[PDB]
Design a protein around this nucleic acid. Sequence first.
DNA 1: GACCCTCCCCTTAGGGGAGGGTC
DNA 2: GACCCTCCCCTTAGGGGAGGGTC
Lengths: 276, 276
Amino acid sequence: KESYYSIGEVSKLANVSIKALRYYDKIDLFKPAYVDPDTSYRYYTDSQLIHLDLIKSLKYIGTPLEEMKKAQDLEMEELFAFYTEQERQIREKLDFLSALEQTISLVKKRMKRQMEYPALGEVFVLDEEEIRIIQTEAEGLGPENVLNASYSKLKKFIESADGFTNNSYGATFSFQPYTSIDEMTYRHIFTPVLTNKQISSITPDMEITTIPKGRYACIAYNFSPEHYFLNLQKLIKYIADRQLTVVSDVYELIIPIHYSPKKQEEYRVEMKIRIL
Amino acid sequence: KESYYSIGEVSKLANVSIKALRYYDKIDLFKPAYVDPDTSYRYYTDSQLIHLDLIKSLKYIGTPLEEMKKAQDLEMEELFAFYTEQERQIREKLDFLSALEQTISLVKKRMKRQMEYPALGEVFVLDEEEIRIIQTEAEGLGPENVLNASYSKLKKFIESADGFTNNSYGATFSFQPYTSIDEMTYRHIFTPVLTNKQISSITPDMEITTIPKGRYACIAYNFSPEHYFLNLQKLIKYIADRQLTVVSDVYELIIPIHYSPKKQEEYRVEMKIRIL
DNA sequence: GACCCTCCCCTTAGGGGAGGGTC
DNA sequence: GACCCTCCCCTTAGGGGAGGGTC
Ligand SMILES: Cc1cc(N)c2ccccc2n1
Ligand SMILES: Cc1cc(N)c2ccccc2n1
């Protein structure tokens, strides 16, 4: 009243950066009442300070500045609706996070399983919770020529639903007394889901289906072309010896141990199978 | 296996932009296995595709890329903890929104009151819910020289707690048969709070206190220097006529109607007072 | 001494464009 | 024809810096 405010003065009492203000001047969001054409100084009336209440608030909810310009104009009738807009926008940014917390929280649950694990190369027998998965016909792939490009479509579907990618790759094959590895080929190959959001439009060549709750003879180890077969052998034997009775395929699960493109690639296999 | 992937090829099956990949090459986050020194083409092995699982996932939770570099290196023991990091980070980005939804939702509740309001210039008598506020000693300000710079400290406190600014300015003064306006000066001046988050460190010269639930003779109108006094008059009269009995100060509340720096400034006053 | 000014280079994570050179 | 390349200008909302000119 009866004098102007310098930008310092405004900044201080309005709690807003000098550089901030200058920018708002620049974009024609908030201009000083008067610019000294001699010194180019910016001066501000007490009246206009009120405009900042909005600019501040709108900022704190993080609406864009170009958006604020369209905002300040409209009067209350509409300003309400606008807020109601933000309100919904929030509730969704909020539904999105609430998803993540769950996803991460489960993804974690699954790494712990990997780490805290009885012992390698031996055949543990244990009780497992069910695991939801997306499957597909193997169309004659084997461990010899399987290839993670082979997973692309499943991945496209998972990532659209989970936003995470599967951090394990699976296949299944019939339990036989296999005498070689070239003897074996996969039946239907698969990857775990984490989310219950619909797969947007599932084609009839994926299959949503599960690895069921039940008793599993399973062996787990780090990968090497050689050990792969030999550990499988341990398994076949373990059953035959104990005269156990299988009721599924063998489920095989490849998991990376690090994603560093610098250390030499290292994978952890798990091969499970259901028995009574 | 036994051939490379072109960037197109990778992009398609990994569902990631060609431009995206090129960038990851540029930052040394994800390099092609091999660059043709003749054509500068980028070629990729099937092996390395696995690195994208992380890069993709990490992206979807929106960790920075420079941060991803530090991530891929560490092995599971730590990768867990890292996630546990994100987990907490989310829960807070989430506590922040959950605040907003509430804040906006109440801020809205209060605009509706403004709009849906019985009638202007007349004296309505009504029942009011309590309103929490921050007060301060008026130190001799009147409607004549009051000035919204006068509000700066309260605002600094509110904005630190609510993140919104008060979109109304208040004062109180003693109920007298005032014969002029120069006769009047404010007692303790104030602004509404919306949040229950502590004011970080409140100085002993603010006061958290309320406008209490109770019966209010109140009049509301658009502002003009002139009407201000005259509407107040209506009020004093209304009481005196009905022989009512006041139990508070008059509470006065200035609210902007638009924040457009283009339309001429327009404010809505409300003056309330408590009676039995 | 304290305050304000106008350039000017920078920070994410790429998208959209030329304009060649190869599939 | 289809695919890939390397510059190059751009998008938020300013912060941090010169290097003058005024308080
Ligand atoms: C990515 C991947 C997935 C498999 N299931 C696999 C099996 C045997 C050997 C190499 C393999 N690679
Ligand atoms: C910002 C503001 C706040 C008030 N309470 C007020 C009172 C009378 C006249 C002008 C005023 N301006």
